[model samples]
Target: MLDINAFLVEKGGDPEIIKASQKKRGDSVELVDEIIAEYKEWVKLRFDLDEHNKKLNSVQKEIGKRFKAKEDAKDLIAEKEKLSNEKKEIIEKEAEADKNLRSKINQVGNIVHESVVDSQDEENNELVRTWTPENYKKPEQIAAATGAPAKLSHHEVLLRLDGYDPERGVRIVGHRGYFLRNYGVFLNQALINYGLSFLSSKGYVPLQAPVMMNKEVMAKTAQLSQFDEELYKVIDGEDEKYLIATSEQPISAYHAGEWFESPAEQLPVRYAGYSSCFRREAGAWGIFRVHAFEKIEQFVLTEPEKSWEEFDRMIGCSEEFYQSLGLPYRVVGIVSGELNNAAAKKYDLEAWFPFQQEYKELVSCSNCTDYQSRNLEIRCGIEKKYVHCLNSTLSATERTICCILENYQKEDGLVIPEVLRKYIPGEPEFIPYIKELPKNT
Candidate 1:
């Protein structure tokens, strides 16, 4: 939720600033004005209620006096009843206006930071930098060095080698689902373990979050409303729950409605969450955009003053993971309209997909500042201020696997990244094709 008072004070009550900031979020100036108008009416209704209360109190006292003096008091009683009825109506209107005003306020996105590029979508996002492994070469350069196509699409290799079964998966589980068999399953586990080990070594506490959460807790993460169609709601029994779309949701909400009294030195609390996330996927299709996937998420609750530093550190962690895989990647600053409701600023790391000859997002790091904390009421500091919350993808199994397959494919097989080699059961450096036996075996 936006702190309206803080926003007004920060912008010095400038309507233009509000209008422009909201415009970057793809919201109209009229909407902002309408919210402001609704707030004014709410405030007016509050004052009206107060005045009605005072009159009611005075009238009640007169009625008491008339009754004590043995006067008929009928007229006084009637007057009091009239005032009480007026008060009840005002109260109802005030409640409705307050609810409507808050609903509008919640629709507004967080104010865009000045450093964010003013764009409408990902196409206009600004690339911060590109990175390649030490002694890395482009596909053509690699081709010249190795005398063959540098890479092959993951699907082609996996499908041909019988490592995955998309057709059988669709028949069993519907579209956008797959069964990872043979080396495909190993690769998935290796990626998950590799990510967990990396973040654990970086002073992050490892946590296995619940895959299902109550709707109320999910709502506090500020994702429920934005991605409603993409969510899977539980219809079991009388209670309402939702399957998590990302571990970030559960991890961030772990400290919901709680207060932290940590010493200044222990200001930042970090967690590495691992979970199997489920999404409706809506219109999305393909393995890269699946309905169920595994993820290793990085979450943090840090002091407001240290949040920006923590944000960059989270990005650095993701970069290190990608770089360790020897994959070509670039960092991009997410533009205003692309940011989620909880994020004040965000960055995405896109890994090079050699087959596509393009970069695809593998991780997104966001600094939500106090937006989520305020919603969850997770407070810290001696003054009980809301802690700044941040979350980022350390690795998502399906997309990272796709990138790995495309970037590390050899002519004969798929090579696992060195960092993940030890995690594989047999420590096989490359997954080579195995011939199928005759029909009778």
Candidate 2:
């Protein structure tokens, strides 16, 4: 929900910048011009509506004076009625014009930030930074690669540890519906719990966001037309609900239609929302698309000026979480073409998978600028300004578990990261049955 008036009428942004942002995505530059045209009609209709209303008010006052003086008031009354009818027509036209202007503006989406392109293919998305843990080396960098000691793929490692039951899961719930066996379940819970605790330590309020959200709220929260395929719907007795993709959705709507009279006191509100997220897409190979998985999300609302700073802070917190686990990862800036409709700018944290010999996305952190807040009408401050929003994956536990399975695997067992050792059964330092002895083998 852009303040369409801002781009065309008010102090939104320069229309040229909006057009450039659209061109960057190879979208409609003409849409901006169309919106400008609509704004002109809307402004005229608005002026006519105001003028008619004023005339109607004046006619009503004259009719009252004529009746009070016992004078002929029939002409004044007729004029009042005519003005009233005309005002209604003008109001209807103004409403339609307003809708048309906003509808066109919404199509343009939020503008991308200046640093978006390092330019072409968005510089393959500028590399923000990399974190390499001790004793870590790329598989190729270590000649035979065995010297790095990571040889098993995540799926193979999980199987070797008897951690998942994909075949049985498929038998019951269809494809991409695997069940985590003993160790897998434990590791998943540990990762989720640790992620929640980690963000909590950083002063974020913890929320157990609802997995089911009402349709009306969701209409404002998500663009159903664009994302319909990716979401699950639950229809219940004349009511419609959408299964939330992430806790981020529910958390963002938590303050819908609410006011923050004092942004200084209420803002920079950070929430570490945890939930079982659902997605309709039967994603790629392995455990990546598990239908529903535990995820801890970071959603924040802050002053507009503070948003970018908070954006980096959110990523820094996630990086610190990964660093705590000693996982090697990199933060990549999203290219113009790669960005989603809502995010002004985005950075994804991809974990280094030694066996796959590739970096896989485990976390995404993005700044929506005032995009979502504007749509949701979330205003703060004494002056009633929209707050900026940022959301990040503190940890997508299932994916992080995959990273752990590969990065921490040894010939004997899975070496649990020190931070997660306490959460495992029997408080063992490993997600394995045998640490050293091969026994009879």
Candidate 3:
């Protein structure tokens, strides 16, 4: 929810918000103003109807008293019946007003993001920077008349050489959601281990949060309100539950409605949360949208003044991860319309994917400021002031898997990054069995 009072003051009430929104949406501001006026009147009607009902009840009590007297009170009885009929009509009108108001709000809200287009599509997205090994030419510079990046799909490579069992996985748990087997499993574990180590070295506490959060806890983080469409809700008889879509939600609300010591050296805590994030992704496709995936989400609760600093640090951390992977990546500053509900300003890190031959978003670090802390009522001091909360993606395993397969695919087999090879005992590349056999043997 927005600061309703602040929003009204800033935009000169709901009328101005609607007018500005209509201008941004390329529609007639007068039409939007008219709708807002109608909605405001409906709100008034809703309140007036409730008050009228109370008065009608009081009048009926008087009518009952006149009846108990056993005198000729036909006029009084008639007035009571008239009052009841009027109350019924008002209730119906209030219902209609509510329906119209809700419909208009939804329609206007959906159009809010259309005015801030920096790019028409993914192809138009600017390539601000790139980084690759000294040996390889820039991906765009390579001579292949085929417009986009030339790379094998993760599924194609994994099925053909990596020994992934899609049919077996489907029999057990449905499509686009499965376990990584053999070396693939080891590779994912290696990635996680490396990520955790990197975070730990930077003074981050590693936390393994609960994958299932009840509605109450989830609501504290406001995850259910705006992101309901993406969330997978759980129903077990009577309880309302939801599988977490990101670890940040729990990490941010870990100390919900709690207080920490203030005026001390370290006032707020920082955490690196790891979780198996689940999403319904009903219409999502490609490697980006899977039912379940792994992610190392970063969160920091700090003094209000230090929030943006921490936000930038996390963004630097995201860049470091991509740089360590030896992949070319770029950072872009996002506008307000591009921001999520909790963010004041956001920065996204897009890593080069050789297969799609395009840069895909792998990390998003946000300076959410005190928006979430205030919304969640999270505080860190005895003063009970809202602390600033910043969240960023340290690593998203699925997207990184897409990056590694595309960029590291060698003519013979996949080449493991040297940094990750240290986690594996003796192997360097973890080459597939197909490429390991002799011609005769």
Candidate 4:
């Protein structure tokens, strides 16, 4: 939520700056003025509510004193009763005003960071840098090196190895559902577990967060009203629950409504969260864009001034992962228009897909700043300032697996990354191709 008190220029907050941000988002600038007017209404009603309550208290005391003094207290009682009815009426208005004020406050997006570009198109995002591993080779180069006229796609490579079956995937479970059999399952698991171990070795608190979140927690973690369609919903009896679309949601909710008692002792906290994410968004097929995926998320809550440092730190970790994996990828700054409600600024790690000769996003590293902290009420210091929240995809295991298959392709089989060798069974360096299917008669 953009600072509500800041809507009134007199409140040491600049509404013009907010309007400017709203303009950049291509959102309604007039909403700021509406919030300003509604804020004043709520403040006035709240003041009247308090004033009437104070009057009732005074009259009650006066009536008690008169009664004890043997003086008839009927007139005082009547005044108190009159004030009681007025208070009740003001109470309703005050509640409504408060709700209205909060709803409007929630309607606006987070304040845009100075570094964000104004365009809403993801294509407009600025590229920060690129890296090509020493083992990097173009699609044609790999094909030439392998001595084949054909280049197999990720799924094709898996199929040749008896790794997965998408035909049955769509048949048994519907679109985008597939069985990761044999080496496919092993490779995917190795990738996910590798991320946890990697981050833990770097001193991150490793955790497996719950994939399901109660509605309130999800709302605080993300803009549910805006992203509701993109998330899976569950109904248990009459209770509403949301299956998290990303591990970031659950990890952020982990510290919901919490505060650091000692900033010096616990100013910055880093967590490497792992979870199976579920999303309801539409997709044709492929593990990369599917209903469920495994992810290792990097989340942090830190002092406000140190948020950018932490932001760069998180993305740096993602880059290190790609670098260690020997994958070609680039980092890009997410444009303001493409940023969701919570992220003040975001960076995505798009890995090179040699098979398609294109780049697809495999990781999202975003600094929500204080946007989520305000919703979750996580505070940092003595003044109870909202802690800055940040999260990034250390590895969306499934998507990264796709990159591995495309980049590690050879005529014989898929070569496993050296870093992941320890995690897989027998430390197998290769997933060999199976040319024949053994049948039981």
Candidate 5:
């Protein structure tokens, strides 16, 4: 679904840029050239086919003129049949050539931003910065102050204090299924509400996106084939549909195949979408990598010139949210190989997990530029140019729950973040519970 015309224009018709871009994606430069060559051939073939059709039409007219004159028209009729048959063959070739050209072109990913680091994997990602609240406490300090264990995994804290039943969850559903009972449910809802409220304050329109999406629209989002194994497809009918992996999928496609007439002042369209997400997660296992979870996602569609500015603002929004929770987090610029197909640039916000003594990704912000808009045919401006699209995670309830469990554990309970307290009924400050030892012991 790449806008070939726009891509060629952006590169100034430089084959080298196409070659280098494909190389960054670990694709064959030779194959790209072949596709480009095939596209040219397809164009020529279509022109030839048109000429043949015109000749056939002329021949048919001659046969009609001969019959109207009451003269023998067998030769003209036979000549018209031959031209018609040749045209059919030409049409078949044109279709085949177009199909081949499109298949190869689609294999090439979006062009990487020039500023993007030329690295192969996440190991080479550049750390942008790290942030920690003034009140942030070390694991040992937190434990000493509360007279609790020095460290406890999020899973252990969830099982003990938060009323998480992994065993029963798996028995009732399947692996990676989880039941968030008691305060866990409250905490989940509170996180969702907090994210929605925060984004709303930032002028984002709140939407509850559809969890089920048409396969075509999903493809336009660049998620269908890339995460095929991770998607849950519905077997409803001839029209294929799949469960969305994130609200981003639906939110990004909200204006698919549409044109916008927004003025410069109304350039950017911001949305905060909440939805239940499902993933098949082929090889992924654990509560943290669950099959189902709820998320609040941030998405934006803006004029091409203002996309990078919006990208920074989106990152700032995520940082503010995490900082408000007093969570220590870091941002990194995703390397080329680690970048999503649609993203020209991407940043990950990883929150520190006290128990693991490491950081885990809590949010991802991406500037897809015009990659998605081109695919979805979402245009803007007076001239109707492709708009730039961006998406970032505001909060994945399950992961945020994990971070809170490990970071805010106390001797008597789990301390809820102050910002989320108002959303919880009665504004409880903490969940007080103690793990019970084996009865026989």
Candidate 6:
């Protein structure tokens, strides 16, 4: 049963969601409630009426046996037929009430939190906050202190270094796609380790989740309903599934309709989920275009009262992650108009990719509130209250690896970061693959 508590709650409560949900499902909330009430009444009435009619039949039979053994007693026969018609009417009414109740219940959608945007589309999202280089300083700050131009475009440098192999990728997967080799692979792993370890130390249990899920779970999580067009579905005759576009889908539903101890007795549970994410790039092209890559996704299911605090902690964790990488980054407050189907409030972490000479999104932290928990029926406590859920991307291996390669590539073709030295045994740097050596040499 769907909990209407969010709708009944005073804070973060919304009436529009109820109206929209009902309308979207092609059902009326009021009609559904009414039918359910009537159906229950009918069930009781049917039991009582059935017994009364049986008693009436017994009495009529006894009268016939005693008063008119062979004669057609018109009055008695009419009375019996009247009782039969009444029973038939009761059955018809009961069936009608049940049908209406079922339709209404099926049509009701989950309650949306107040923080969610009123409009559709990502562009209309409200901006909460943003940061820029002027807010902080580094070695490059001195050069641009007088307003000198910044570095080259990252794509240009990639072309110069032959680091991005579009032709090779096209030969294998298609355009705007390529595999990370040599220093690229090492850089990607370094970013993954750095991000995962940070979350781990913060008490988040790290887990590797599956990359595929069934359509029903996706629909329950609302992915299939809103973002279906962007997803890659698996179609094998009658069986329907989809490749995971993000780890949040599987991880959130991993314990779908189940509950867990708020780990360590902290009254909330959190996870740092690692997985390979896939998407269909049918229309996307250029830097942001790719079919699949690695992502570190962090999620927390917490007591309703602590969700806001946990959301803030998630934001802080994201900022700290980028800072630890020693990269120039800024946090932008996202608006509702720009939010996805699931997020209420969102923050995008834009890191200064020296090559692109502009900030690019590396992580997105969102406060989904209890929207997903309610949809997934992930409730806890005797009252069966809905838990609050929040998700944030700690790091994406593709873009981070690209940033490290372009920023840390040295004169000798060796790539290394000063922060990762402690983890690489004695080799502080990675040598390029022999195949990557310039052909002209």
User: Which 10-residue window in model 3 sums to the lowest lDDT?
Assistant: 141-150
TM-score for each prediction? 0.91, 0.90, 0.70, 0.92, 0.92, 0.70
Best lDDT among the predictions, by candidate number: 4
lDDT of 5 by residue, 193-260 (tens): 99999999999999999899887778777644655587888878666688988998888888888887
**Which one wins by lDDT: 4 or 5?**
4
Model 6 lDDT-worst window of ten: 141-150
Higher-ranked by lDDT: 1 or 6? 1
Cα lDDT tens digits for candidate 6, 287-379: 344778889989888877777788889988987776665566666666434555456567788776554566678888877766677768776
lDDT of 4 by residue, 34-66 (tens): 999988888898888889888988998898899
Candidate 4 residue-wise lDDT at 36: 92
Q: Global CA lDDT of candidate 5, please?
A: 0.80
lDDT for each residue of candidate 1 in 283-318, tens digit (9 for 90 to 100): 532357788999999999999888999999999999
Clashing pairs in 5: none
For model 3, the local distance difference test gives 0.66
- Window of ten residues with lowest summed lDDT in model 1: 139-148
Superposed by TM-score, candidate 4 places the C-alpha of residue 279 at a distance from the truth, in angstroms, of 0.4
lDDT of 1: 0.80
Poorly placed runs, candidate 2 (over 4 Å) = 9-13, 61-82, 118-123, 139-149, 433-441
Better model by TM-score: candidate 1 vs candidate 2: 1
Write out the backbone clash pairs for model 3.
Answer: 131-328, 149-357, 151-355
The candidate, 3 or 5, that scores higher on TM-score is 5
The regions of model 1 sitting more than 4 angstroms off are 7-16, 139-148, 223-227, 261-263, 282-286, 435-441
